[PDB]
Amino acid sequence: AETTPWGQTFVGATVLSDSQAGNRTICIIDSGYDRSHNDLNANNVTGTNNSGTGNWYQPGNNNAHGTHVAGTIAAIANNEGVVGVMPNQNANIHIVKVFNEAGWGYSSSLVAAIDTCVNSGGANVVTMSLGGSGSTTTERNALNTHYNNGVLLIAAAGNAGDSSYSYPASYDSVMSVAAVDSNLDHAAFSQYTDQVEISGPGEAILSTVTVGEGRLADITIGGQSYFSNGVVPHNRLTPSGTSYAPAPINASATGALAECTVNGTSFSCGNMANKICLVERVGNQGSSYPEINSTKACKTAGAKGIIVYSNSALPGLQNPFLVDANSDITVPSVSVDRATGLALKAKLGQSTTVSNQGNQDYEYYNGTSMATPHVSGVATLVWSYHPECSASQVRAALNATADDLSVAGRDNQTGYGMINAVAAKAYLDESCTGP
Ligand SMILES: [Ca+2]
Ligand SMILES: [Ca+2]
Ligand code: NA
Ligand code: NA
């Protein structure tokens, strides 16, 4: 079975066709591309090796970022895994690997990586799900030159949760991308600046990862699965020295579905022994990490499995950090959006199986680095319908047709709003400058 992650549907890429994407080339400057992956192997992908990062087609261990980004752009349509913005093996993809597991390992600069994308890869679009705090005139000038020469530059705004400028996103020649969740709410971690230009799906984004390094979750009732609704395995963290480290619980639990009613700030769980405990999330991640509250309420009651669903404040699908100070959550627990949680209410009392599985080939990630490929993927897709238009013209089309989010007009949190592939295409259909 193949799943279409919510982000793919929201940007409106599933309704268009990438049949002409062969006239475009998108270059991914990131941590490499796992070409051995079934959902990425058969893409029209090439790359340019660098002495400091080995093979572009071999990310290495625990260096799956670029593969996740690539999957959002072009995971192959094939009845397995997922699908990217351009899933039909048409778009040309060029890979420049600047990151090793240890960090930046490129023998040269970001400018050099972009040069490679353009000169070696023939890139029309350069997507950069990366950022640094520093800025320079030489870099600003080099990127402006590429942009004026017709290369569309897109990058992540950053996940520091403040107003700091991340570069290259914050240069005028680059589109700074913000992250929003499935309810179109601004992601708490998404940096807000006057450079933020457009938004893309960035919370709980399912995509391809280096084979065997992923993790998935599932909820089954009556022989049917809620996987396609979006089931996130709790990103559990437990104490490790002076900080916290990952401590995922990968197992399955089966039992009658029972809900722990939330009254104010108290929980009415009752006896959850031998039961799958459904509970509404109390609070939300931001200044703190409250996931443990609703989760532990269930555990303390004796729950075998736990399902936390979004509250009205942030009804979208959340993939929060489950900070477990006392390592109390030793059972499988997952997170689902509000709609799914309410639907599960009708199934109370029925046998339910909740499961978290490791060693997978896909995984949910959060980040402006996840929103970025949605934007660059769509930019490439839309541009393929009108390759005669310039990068600046396509950029304008995306901004002019984005769906306004948050406060009316452009804002620092979401820019012009959610990218809209269909509307952007219709815009260029009139002319390279719109109607
Ligand atoms: Ca697939
Ligand atoms: Ca707005
Ligand atoms: Na910018
Ligand atoms: Na920008």
> How does DSSP assign 56-91, residue by residue?
TT---SS--HHHHHHHHHHPPPSSSB---SS-SS-S
- Taking the CA of 399 as reference, the closest ligand is 4
Nearest-5° angle of CA 261, CA 290, CA 203?
100
Q: Which domain holds residue 114?
A: 1-214+360-435
What is the DSSP code (8-state) at residue 19?
Answer: T
- Residue 12 near residue 200 (C-beta atoms within 8 A): no
Q: Which of 324, 432, 379, 386 is nearest to 197 (CA)?
A: 379
127 and 183 fall within a common domain: yes
Q: Who contacts 213 (Cβ-Cβ below 8 Å, separation ≥6)?
A: 61, 62, 64, 363
248 and 336 fall within a common domain: yes
Distance, CA of 306 to CA of 299 (rounded, Å): 8
Cα diameter, the chain = 67
Q: Is 278 helix (H, G, I), strand (E, B) or coil?
A: strand
Provide the H-helix boundaries in 205-290: none
- Residue 324 near residue 238 (C-beta atoms within 8 A): yes
Residues with CB under 5 A from ligand 4 (ion): 176, 195, 197
Burial of 273 (0-12, 13-18, 19+ CB in 10 A): exposed
The tokens for 42 are: 């058969």
Q: How many CB atoms lie within 10 A of CB 163?
A: 11
The full DSSP string for 368-424 is HHHHHHHHHHHHHHHHHH-TTS-HHHHHHHHHHHSB--SSSS-BTTTBT-B--HHHH
Q: How many CB atoms lie within 10 A of CB 228?
A: 12
81 and 139 fall within a common domain: yes
Q: Which amino acid is at 294?
A: S
Distance, CA of 68 to CA of 57 (rounded, Å): 13
Å from CA of 411 to ligand 2 middle: 5
Total structural domains within the chain: 2
Q: What is the Cα 371 distance to its own chain's centre?
A: 6
Residues with CB under 5 A from ligand 1 (ion): 2, 39, 76, 78, 81
Å from CA of 179 to ligand 3 middle: 15
The tokens for 317 are: 């699908």
141 and 290 fall within a common domain: no
Å from CA of 94 to ligand 4 middle: 23
- Residue 177 near residue 186 (C-beta atoms within 8 A): no
206 and 256 fall within a common domain: no
- Taking the CA of 170 as reference, the closest ligand is 3
Nearest-5° angle of CA 273, CA 278, CA 284?
125
Å from CA of 199 to ligand 3 middle: 13
Q: Which of 302, 337, 359 is the last residue in one of the domains?
A: 359
Instruction: Give the CB-side neighbour count of residue 90, counting CA atoms within 13 A.
Output: 19
CA dihedral 418, 368, 56, 357 (to 10 degrees): -100
Q: Which of 312, 340, 359 is the last residue in one of the domains?
A: 359
Distance, CA of 285 to CA of 320 (rounded, Å): 6
355 and 377 fall within a common domain: no
Q: Are strands 125-128 and 152-156 parallel, antiparallel or unpaired?
A: parallel
Residue 152 to residues 127, 128, 371, 409, Cα–Cα distance (Å): 8, 11, 16, 24
Q: Which of 359, 376, 398 is the last residue in one of the domains?
A: 359
21 and 152 fall within a common domain: yes
- Residue 281 near residue 311 (C-beta atoms within 8 A): yes
SS3 string, 85-145, reads: CCCCCCCEEEEEECEECCEECCCCCHHHHHHHHHHCCCCCEEEECCCECCCCHHHHHHHHH
Q: Who contacts 407 (Cβ-Cβ below 8 Å, separation ≥6)?
A: none
Nearest-5° angle of CA 284, CA 289, CA 290?
60
Å from CA of 255 to ligand 4 middle: 50
CATH number of the CATH domain containing 293: 3.50.30.30
In 202-269, at which residue ranges do the beta strands (DSSP E only) sit?
205-208, 214-221, 224-225, 232-233, 235-240, 243-246, 252-263, 266-268
425 and 331 fall within a common domain: no
Distance, CA of 75 to CA of 70 (rounded, Å): 7
Q: Which amino acid is at 247?
A: A
Nearest-5° angle of CA 376, CA 143, CA 64?
45
- Taking the CA of 171 as reference, the closest ligand is 3
Q: Per 3-state DSSP, what percentage of the chain is helix, strand, and coil (rounded to 5)?
A: 25, 30, 50
400 and 310 fall within a common domain: no
- Residue 319 near residue 333 (C-beta atoms within 8 A): no
34 and 50 fall within a common domain: yes
392 and 353 fall within a common domain: no
Which residues are bridge partners to 277 per DSSP?
258, 306
CA dihedral 358, 363, 365, 371 (to 10 degrees): 180
What is the DSSP code (8-state) at residue 194?
Answer: T
CATH number of the CATH domain containing 149: 3.40.50.200
Distance, CA of 322 to CA of 316 (rounded, Å): 17
92 and 203 fall within a common domain: yes
Å from CA of 164 to ligand 4 middle: 13
